[PDB]
Amino acid sequence: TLRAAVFDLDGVLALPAVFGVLGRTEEALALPRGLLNDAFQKGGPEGATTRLMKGEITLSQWIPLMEENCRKCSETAKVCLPKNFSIKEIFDKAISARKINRPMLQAALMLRKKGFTTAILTNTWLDDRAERDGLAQLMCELKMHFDFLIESCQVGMVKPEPQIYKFLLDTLKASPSEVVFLDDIGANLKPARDLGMVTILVQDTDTALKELEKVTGIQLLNTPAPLPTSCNPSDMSHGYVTVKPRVRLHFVELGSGPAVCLCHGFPESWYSWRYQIPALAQAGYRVLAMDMKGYGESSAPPEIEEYCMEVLCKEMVTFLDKLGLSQAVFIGHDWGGMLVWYMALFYPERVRAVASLNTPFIPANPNMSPLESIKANPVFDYQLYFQEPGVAEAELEQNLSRTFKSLFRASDESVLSMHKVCEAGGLFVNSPEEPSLSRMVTEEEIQFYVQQFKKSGFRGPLNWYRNMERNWKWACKSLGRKILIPALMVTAEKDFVLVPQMSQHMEDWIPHLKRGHIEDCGHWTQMDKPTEVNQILIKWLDSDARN
Amino acid sequence: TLRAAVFDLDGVLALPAVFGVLGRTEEALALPRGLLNDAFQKGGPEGATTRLMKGEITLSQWIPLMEENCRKCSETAKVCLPKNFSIKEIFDKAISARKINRPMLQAALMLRKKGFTTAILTNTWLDDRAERDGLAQLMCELKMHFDFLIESCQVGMVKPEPQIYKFLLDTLKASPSEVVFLDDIGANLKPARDLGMVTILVQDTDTALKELEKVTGIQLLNTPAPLPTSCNPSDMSHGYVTVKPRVRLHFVELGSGPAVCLCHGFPESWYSWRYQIPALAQAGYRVLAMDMKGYGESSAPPEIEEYCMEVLCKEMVTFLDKLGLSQAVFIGHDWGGMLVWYMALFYPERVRAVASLNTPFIPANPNMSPLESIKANPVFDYQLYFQEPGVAEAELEQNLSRTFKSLFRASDESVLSMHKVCEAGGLFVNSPEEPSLSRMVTEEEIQFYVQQFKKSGFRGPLNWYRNMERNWKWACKSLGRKILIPALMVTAEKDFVLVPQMSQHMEDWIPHLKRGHIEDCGHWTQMDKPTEVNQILIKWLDSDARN
Ligand SMILES: O=C(O)CNC(=O)NC1CCCCC1
Ligand SMILES: O=C(O)CNC(=O)NC1CCCCC1
Ligand SMILES: [Mg+2]
Ligand SMILES: [Mg+2]
Known part of the structure; x- marks a missing residue:
């Protein structure tokens, strides 16, 4: 039945969720729980972040837009912000911190090696930071290991918007019934299930895999360490x-x-x-x-x-x-x-x-x-x-x-x-x-x-x-x-x-x-x-x- | 008549003569005029430097051999040597200091562009210094602009030894009468003339060229600044x-x-x-x-x-x-x-x-x-x-x-x-x-x-x-x-x-x-x-x- 595995980047193939860093920044700086995240998700569908996610504006354009949010959100909860507070400084650190979740990537490869069509569906942005090369290199690596790579800021659609899921389905050339979608965000799983796709809430890597191993009937966990990557002459x-x-x-x-x-x-x-x-x-x-x-x-x-x-x-x-x-x-x-x-x-x-x-x-x-x-x-x-x-x-x-x-x-x-x-x-x-x-x-x-x-x-x-x-x-x-x-x-x-x-x-x-x-x-x-x-x-x- | 121009590296296409630095080191360090140069030319045909010049030993092997010479030669003239004296330190500096004598290289190109077969005849060594890449790059550039590049430490012959001149002649596929040989060292000019080749003692660049311009009947000096280097598709x-x-x-x-x-x-x-x-x-x-x-x-x-x-x-x-x-x-x-x-x-x-x-x-x-x-x-x-x-x-x-x-x-x-x-x-x-x-x-x-x-x-x-x-x-x-x-x-x-x-x-x-x-x-x-x-x-x- 299943023939396609689609992985999310932040929180699935890449950890630690560049996202999560926000919660820590707050705890770290003793900021009102969620202060930073609220300024982030500010505007909802019409948010500066949603724009930046659909490729409307660059990350560099977003940073200043995300600073104001940290002032408005701080203005409501009756709070402030250190003098050396930098959204830029925070994210550059968060991003370069993120690494390829090895066991996950490997699990993905295995699936592919056994007939599965793999793909990365992610809500990313157009990174024009000076340290943008970071991401560039991380992707330069993941890219090859997946048939498709559907970026939000590239397709003009972000995740929960169903449109993208039809896009995914249409891109994979497969029907929901034969697709597994893994995300660390619940909301991103509903649209998936509403289409009738097998969804897996990825919390701790090892468990997600267990479920994946289960749903796909292929041993992904505790499996022998593969051989390095071999290269295809024609590529x-x-x-x-x-x-x-x-x-x-x-x-x-x-x-x-x-x-x-x-x-x-x-x-x-x-x-x-x-x-x-x-x-x-x-x-x-x-x-x-x-x-x-x-x-x-x-x-x-x-x-x-x-x-x-x-x-x-x-x-x-x-x-x-x-x-x-x-x-x-x-x-x-x-x-x-x-x-x-x-x-x-x-x-x-x-x-x-x-x-x-x-x-x-x-x-x-x-x-x-x-x-x-x-x-x-x-x-x-x-x-x-x-x-x-x-x-x-x-x-x-x-x-x-x-x-x-x-x-x-x-x-x-x-x-x-x-x-x-x-x-x-x-x-x-x-x-x-x-x-x-x-x-x-x-x-x-x-x-x-x-x-x-x-x-x-x-x-x-x-x-x-x-x-x-x-x-x-x-x-x-x-x-x-x-x-x-x-x-x-x-x-x-x-x-x-x-x-x-x-x-x-x-x-x-x-x-x-x-x-x-x-x-x-x-x-x-x-x-x-x-x-x-x-x-x-x-x-x-x-x-x-x-x- | 003339159809070949052969240039020397140190003192002709490259300046300042990595050699000369010795004289300055002495003047600089108030050392007995020639102390350093004598230790350098020590052993004559059977000298450590002649070996190093014929490719018998590497520059790295030579340095220590050239240090002892600075002690023996210092032992004869009743002298000493500072505590921070380094043959290595001296030469690394001397070498990277040397640059392509632009007007000379250009003069060479012109000649080639007008039918001349060019070549670099030099008494060089096998550079295995950590900063060897210096030379590597300088040559990487000069090399292309000349039909041949006859290195002493490569052909197993150094300059005055006539053998190399027959080698040059034989390599150029030309007779002395139609070859111009330029060197900054007199001794290297005799063997050349004894073969009947036009020789030019290169002291100050501009004059050498004047003579070259003269002997070759081509305007090399005060000539329009060329176009950058164009590349040959097949190369x-x-x-x-x-x-x-x-x-x-x-x-x-x-x-x-x-x-x-x-x-x-x-x-x-x-x-x-x-x-x-x-x-x-x-x-x-x-x-x-x-x-x-x-x-x-x-x-x-x-x-x-x-x-x-x-x-x-x-x-x-x-x-x-x-x-x-x-x-x-x-x-x-x-x-x-x-x-x-x-x-x-x-x-x-x-x-x-x-x-x-x-x-x-x-x-x-x-x-x-x-x-x-x-x-x-x-x-x-x-x-x-x-x-x-x-x-x-x-x-x-x-x-x-x-x-x-x-x-x-x-x-x-x-x-x-x-x-x-x-x-x-x-x-x-x-x-x-x-x-x-x-x-x-x-x-x-x-x-x-x-x-x-x-x-x-x-x-x-x-x-x-x-x-x-x-x-x-x-x-x-x-x-x-x-x-x-x-x-x-x-x-x-x-x-x-x-x-x-x-x-x-x-x-x-x-x-x-x-x-x-x-x-x-x-x-x-x-x-x-x-x-x-x-x-x-x-x-x-x-x-x-x-x-
Ligand atoms: O060239 C050399 O120095 C040594 N070469 C080999 O040993 N080649 C293998 C060819 C295939 C059979 C085993 C030896
Ligand atoms: O593509 C563009 O934006 C503008 N292109 C040109 O102007 N091309 C030249 C072709 C040869 C004739 C002159 C114009
Ligand atoms: Mg996610
Ligand atoms: Mg010379």
Whole structure:
């Protein structure tokens, strides 16, 4: 029956009710109980506040109009008002004080995730205060999590006025019988019920939910803590920068603030950051999730030299150059991590801070060459099998779906022998033709990667592994340096190829290196433990990158 | 003969020579003349500074190494050093003190603009200081104005070492005989001359130029002040955001900082901002030059309603939503200006500040309808001729090249009667088939607009003029409000359709409205007086938007 959940802002998705603050201001200032609220609701339908609620006048225009009310109302009850009394000062404080009632927003999401059409019906105003950005940001966040957002000062109708409820109904394209309306104000519930909608008086959050859980027959309370917000490719802003005649890099941009450039690994995409992209943005940053040269919508020249670490790095400096960014926080995973370490070693000027996940910085050995060293570690055997051009491509491209479902797996799921790969003659030689779906990725998520690699295949990506000798000779130029800029090394316990023990000597080249670890975390960090990663990175960015 | 000009950074394109500061530090601190410089050049080819110059060690690694030198050198001349002596403190100050020697950079540009291949050959270092961003930004600017930038700490060679000069020669793809090398250090000139290159000892800027002007046979000195920097479309970063199922907006992004959204007018493009885009970026902002719905790479649905002011505005709020921007500075011209005024009236929350060029805010008249009002102003007659769908399209699309060359003209150039257009049955009825090339635009610039309008034509753009009634009824909803957020109204003297006298009553609806005017400035402001516009907007942004 029910198919729509509509939430109120002040007192439901947002607390504490910017409203309530009035009652406290009075108690606080020992003012006649209701003095402030009466001046607020003064004029009723023809009130200054009702106007301000219908978008007739701005909040800034209202404040003075709401001051007079505090004098008239004070003139009736035979009272006064302190000298430092400020309606502005009061509301700015009340508003910024209000925060997203997390459990409520989550309850809303759940409903949506299970077929419900969500919407926010609220009696708000046109905020032109200097601190208006407060609201702006709060909404900037809530907005995305709801199909609709019906603002009073926008639709020219406020709440109890039935008109708006017909509007809501008509907007949702649903009849009262299949809609749940939650408000903290009783009056706003009647019109709702008179239409025959399920209404819930939201007093204490937990109870409202109980009723909601009840009426909707979905478990909203004491429910497992979700995964961070994932972003829909088609809703993202896509960016393209030509760094060289035949090379254009594609990236997804979201947020404002210190620029944080995310460089995924092999064989991934910008999408590999789908969980930290909103989080970090929301965290106060301007996230630039890259599509590393050779992947997704980025250029993939066939040439192997085109993917040596030096070239790749210069192109990233150029990417910044073209974008007008002097610096930028570089956070990389897998190959991306290798890339950002060399970005801090050759372009400190452009790297605001450096951070790597799984990939440890290990100064190249002046004597022994890469090929030799790699051969000295059964786990890296897969890298040798990536040398012969075409060979690896053929297997990986054979069945994209199977390729990604076989790769992207938790540490406990495995299904890909990694020891004797060159020996087995293949990476999948003894793997299922139809691998089970990993916990980390949904069918869609995998198909996204598929369509992406259908463009340029695995030749470009694989070439990242085909410049060992070159990258080595380059790295040798930096054997005298040291990472002195803010750095963070996040290691993942259950990563059996990029084992944490490999980063134990990093502090020698990176003295003030900070760290992070993650339990039961396979190689595919972003996907495996998204919450932990966002938490770890934001904490670090906030203390070392925002400066 | 000459075809290449290579400039040194410290002492040529950048002053005052971060170097020289040493001599002053000594004089300042009454230190034995050269004490500090000797500790600096200590070790010669095998010096700590030579290493740091070849990229062997970072500046941060060097500082301590350069301190010891100040003790050894002080130990020889029988001297000491104050307690608050800091090599770090000294250099940070010296470096941020250095600025782009404007006349020199300009001289360089000129040369390039006249066929010269320019390049910066410098003995720099890997700056990993906390204030490294200083250099980063200075280079971020110089870099673009030169074909090449050969850094010592990057190429593994410092200056006098001939190797680098062969490198320069080989990089420029030119022989000594056709290259001019300018340095403030004599030693760096010999290797140059030994190759047979024209060298110029740069002491005082003006003289160096005189010699340069001489050797190159091009007037570099006392030459007219150029136009701001224009941006090459193919070098710009392009962004795409889908705001609705069938609507994707295209924009050009450059810079970092408060987001400033530029909304061009009819019939233009993001390119109409080609002069303020770098300037503003360089000014400390994140410029987002839009391609307004109906233009360039943006979607152009045929529907007329799709271009009413309300719809257009919601889509801009969505553009922000998708980009993760809570606010944004909206600056518009012509129709764009009309758009940003309504953006401040319906979405104050999202507009950090509002600014308009030419277009004045004029509250809609509750009684009289648009059609009627417009008919009451012979100059607006052109707008009536834009009503009948197809008609205007046919003429404007007939000859794009002629269309734009006829439109984009200084106030003194004219060539398009505007009075009786509906009467003449056409906007070009008595205009040349091959209009002369305006001072404001080069042939290429015009052809850019052409190729752009070859995509969606003039139907989309023209529809902006086809929603009068609708926009009117919408505007009436805001007749009670007022623009209380930071606003700037820039008027152009010689604009005969959007005359300055039309903005004389704005302060009534926008109390704290700031202003700007421009002399002899036709309608096409961005193009007519680019310098004045950048100056006006940056001044305002810096005091009202950066806050
Ligand atoms: O480039 C590096 O330094 C190390 N890269 C990897 O370990 N990549 C994974 C690819 C997928 C299978 C596991 C290893
Ligand atoms: O939209 C408005 O409010 C006013 N627009 C114009 O004046 N546009 C120009 C187009 C090219 C010819 C001159 C007028
Ligand atoms: Mg409420
Ligand atoms: Mg010099």
